């Protein structure tokens, strides 16, 4: 099959073959494992000071003075314990915590490919959160070729149907709920489209827009493809980006994309087919269970066991 | 009160479902579990239990072991719920049909170049769900190095090696060495 | 992650699995490996035969690249020939154009004899041979050779 390509104005203009990276199986378990390890590698260490609580002079008074045995400053003030005001922590935090995590190169490439394949579904992009109800194709390729004024770049995103997703992002900016607003994280906005470009200047006209991000096709970032560790981002490909995907995967030395497999849609079809159904054979009829009750109560209840009636009813 | 202790033992725990997060394993196990309940065949019952095992209970199978086991019955489908690797010490491979969970890239290339077929368990499910003209096979569950140190080296009937490095002599030169 | 650990399931239990009679104290057996011949003797003899004592000659400085000695069996020899060429060599069991395999180029010194070879003449050059590696090679029509 071929993807469609649209002008910077909205009509159909060209067709390109599907890159083979979209046929990789969908693995929300592998995308979650990689997203977790690589988002831990951006952390800045923190720790308390190594002298904190231990700059004072304090020793135990011992028994015989009607007081508890912790170390005390000259004068008798509690010190040097985690349960004393002003003492050290029981186990102080240290910067030698292992902050980063390792991931193999094979599993890093699987996560990018599985996250890119999720982006080719109009049902997973919708369920990720985006507004794509007025979009020509969800594998959305568009010919722009140079964009410098934000005013022109806003005109394309309208000219196609991604206008409601950026206003979704624009009207959502707010002050966050907790302590985070003292620590340089005061505002929050939702995330919109991702424009992926190869050989054309677009970054100047797209960057200022709320909820927009920029990726040169040779280096695609998994934290951008799966915000929140959820796979299906909406992606606006430039034409030259979309037409170099296979060249990029040919540039990875001794690498082959993983093997395509079937889905639960495909398994549910087979079982309802004459090659599998013709092997079916019914179960025996199942036991029949009543409650206990006294046969001697009535004529009819007793007759169920013995019909003749030699047995007295009561 | 009721006495339910004498003559009665403690119940047992076994894997009744795979614990893998791979969606392809859940789909296949759930499918073969269905076929068993509508067939009662003991081939689909052993195969449903193999798909719950824990990857140390699913050792690999090489092509040369299959070529050896399938000899004289070469018209049958080998069924393996594990990975099929390659054996480069065998120079020529015969033609055979193998159905496995996974093939190595080099084992697939060799199997096909002889005229053979590499099936998947969903190809098996569609064409032969109850195992007609199929044989179930597995590798050596006790081939791991870890399972070679189980026990008490040092006891006179052990035949097991110790774990670390031991540079001495005491107890290591046979009986009457302590 | 701290939030899935067994130790957080013991909040409210007075003693975090260490018992009331015994308790959790500092070092009730001593530190490290001490006691192996006296009060841990039942442990050391059951699992560590040959931990105590001396055995054999000592060398004050071992030369790691003298004692290095890689090996290859005869059943692995034909996999050193690239696949594109193996078929043709088997096809024409030549005495006058037999394949030559120099195993030091691949980084082996001695050739051992586990396995078997295909019915095809071949020449193997190495630095040392075992006695049944030579025997199985001459059984096939092959020759062994020594190389610098």
């Amino acid at each position: 099959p071929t993807v469609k390509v649209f002008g910077p104005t909205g009509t159909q203009v060209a067709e390109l073959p599907r890159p083979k990276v979209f046929n990789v199986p969908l693995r929300p378990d592998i995308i979650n494992f990689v997203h977790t390890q690589l988002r831990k590698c951006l952390r800045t260490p923190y720790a308390v000071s190594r002298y904190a609580g231990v700059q004072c002079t304090a020793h135990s008074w011992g028994p015989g003075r009607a007081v508890a045995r912790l170390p005390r400053k000259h004068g008798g003030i509690g010190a040097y314990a985690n349960f004393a005001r002003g003492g050290h922590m029981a186990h102080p935090t240290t910067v030698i915590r292992r902050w980063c995590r390792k991931v193999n190169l094979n599993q890093r490439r699987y996560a990018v490919a599985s996250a890119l394949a999720a982006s080719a579904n109009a049902a997973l992009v919708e369920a990720r959160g985006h507004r794509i109800a007025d979009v020509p194709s969800i594998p959305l390729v568009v010919d722009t070729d140079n964009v410098t004024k934000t005013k022109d770049a806003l005109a394309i995103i309208k000219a196609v149907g991604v206008l409601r997703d950026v206003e979704r992002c624009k009207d959502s900016r707010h002050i966050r709920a907790g302590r985070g607003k003292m620590r340089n994280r005061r505002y929050i906005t939702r995330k919109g489209p991702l424009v992926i470009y190869n050989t054309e200047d677009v970054a100047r006209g797209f960057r200022n827009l709320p909820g927009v991000d920029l990726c040169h096709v040779s280096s695609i970032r998994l934290l951008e493809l799966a915000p929140g560790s959820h796979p299906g981002r909406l992606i606006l490909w430039t034409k030259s980006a979309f037409a170099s995907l296979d060249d990029v995967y040919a540039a990875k030395q001794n690498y082959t994309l993983p093997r395509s497999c079937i889905t639960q849609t495909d398994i549910e079809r087979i079982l309802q087919s004459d090659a599998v159904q013709k092997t079916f054979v019914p179960k025996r009829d199942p036991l029949v269970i009543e409650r206990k009750v006294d046969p001697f109560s009535s004529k009819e209840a007793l007759a169920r066991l013995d019909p003749s009636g030699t047995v007295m009813p009561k | 009160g009721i006495d339910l202790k004498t003559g009665i033992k403690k119940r047992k725990v076994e894997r009744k479902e795979p614990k893998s997060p791979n969606p392809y394993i859940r789909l296949l196990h759930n499918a073969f579990k269905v076929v068993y309940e509508n067939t009662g065949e003991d081939f689909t019952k052993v195969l449903t239990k193999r798909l719950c095992l824990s990857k140390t209970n699913r050792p690999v199978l090489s092509v040369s072991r299959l070529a050896h086991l399938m000899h004289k019955r070469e018209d049958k489908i080998a069924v393996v719920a594990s990975t099929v690797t390659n054996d480069e010490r065998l120079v020529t491979i015969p033609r055979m049909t193998i159905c496995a969970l996974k093939f190595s890239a080099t084992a697939r290339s060799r199997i096909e170049k002889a005229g053979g077929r590499c099936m998947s368990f969903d190809e098996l499910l569609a064409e032969k769900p109850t195992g007609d003209n199929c044989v179930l096979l597995q590798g050596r569950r006790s081939c791991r190095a870890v399972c070679k140190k189980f026990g008490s080296p040092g006891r006179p009937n052990s035949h097991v090696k110790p774990k670390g490095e031991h540079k001495g002599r005491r107890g290591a030169r046979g009986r009457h060495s302590w | 992650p701290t939030r899935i650990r067994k130790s957080r399931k013991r909040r409210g239990h007075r003693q975090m699995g260490y018992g009331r009679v015994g308790g959790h104290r500092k070092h009730p057996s001593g530190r490290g490996k001490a006691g192996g011949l006296q009060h841990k003797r039942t442990s050391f003899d059951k699992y560590h035969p040959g931990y105590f004592g001396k055995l054999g000659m000592r060398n004050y400085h071992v030369r790691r690249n003298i004692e290095y000695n890689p090996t290859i069996n005869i059943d692995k020899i034909w996999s050193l020939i690239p696949e594109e060429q193996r078929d043709g060599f088997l096809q024409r069991k030549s005495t006058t154009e037999a394949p030559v395999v120099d195993v030091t180029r691949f980084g082996f010194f001695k050739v051992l004899g586990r396995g078997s070879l295909p019915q095809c003449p071949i020449i193997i050059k190495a630095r040392y041979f075992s006695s049944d590696a030579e025997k199985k090679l001459r059984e096939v029509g092959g020759v062994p050779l020594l190389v610098p």
């Binding site: 910067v95 030698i96 | 670390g164 | 442990s43």
Partner: peptide, 30 residues
């Protein structure tokens, strides 16, 4: 009966005093 291999790790030196024997790699990207 515990069957483990004896650890061959050396005890830490100079942890709270002496010369600093911990080298970090936070400056590696810089």
């Amino acid at each position: 009966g515990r069957n483990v291999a004896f650890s061959n790790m050396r005890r830490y030196k100079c942890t709270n005093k002496g010369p600093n024997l911990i080298k970090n790699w936070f400056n590696q990207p810089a």
